[PDB]
Every structure is written in structure tokens, then in C-alpha cells.
């Protein structure tokens, strides 16, 4: 949902008050990506265990 997928692109383009709105979307998305990855690895770990 952000204006761009590259973090440095938003940092190099938008001001801090405008970049934080778009950077938060990447953080919210990239955080959920790790929460999904870690959730699967934690579950698959129990399977392999």
C-alpha cells in the first residue's frame, strides 16, 4: 500500500512527516511478513521436532 517498495526510495524522496506515513506501511507489511514466516517456521519446527 505504500508509494514505493524500496525503503531508500521513500527516504530519498519524501520529507520526514510524509515519509513516515509511507515507511510505516512498509514496516507494518514487512513486520507481518516476518510474523508469518516465523509463525510457519515455529510450526514447521514442531513438525520436524
Amino acid at each position: 500500500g505504500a508509494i514505493s517498495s524500496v525503503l531508500n526510495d521513500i527516504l530519498s524522496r519524501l520529507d520526514p512527516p510524509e515519509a513516515e506515513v509511507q515507511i510505516d506501511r512498509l514496516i507494518t507489511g514487512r513486520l507481518q511478513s516476518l510474523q508469518t514466516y516465523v509463525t510457519q517456521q515455529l510450526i514447521r519446527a514442531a513438525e520436524i521436532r
Partner: protein, 48 residues
């Protein structure tokens, strides 16, 4: 672009192609010669 002789209509605007050059854009924001300077999708000072 800015100091042109005359502008065209709001539907037949004169689209000037700017290519193979360099120029300061942050000074235009702080030139004190324009009414409004607001950039969307990019900061007016960082695009310079």
C-alpha cells in the same frame, strides 16, 4: 518553463520536454518568486 513569453490554455497546455541538462530545483522552492510550491510523491528539496 517559468519565464516563458506566454502560456497556453488549460486544455492545450505547452508541454516542454526537459532532457539532457541539470538545474537546481530546491532553489525554486525557496526562490521567493512563486505563490505556491507543493510537490506530490516527492519533497521539493530532496528531488534536487
Amino acid at each position: 518553463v517559468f519565464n516563458a513569453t506566454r502560456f497556453a490554455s488549460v486544455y492545450a497546455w505547452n508541454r516542454k520536454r526537459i532532457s539532457n541538462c541539470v538545474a537546481d530545483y530546491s532553489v525554486l522552492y525557496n526562490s521567493a518568486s512563486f505563490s505556491t510550491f507543493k510537490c506530490y510523491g516527492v519533497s521539493p528539496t530532496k528531488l534536487n
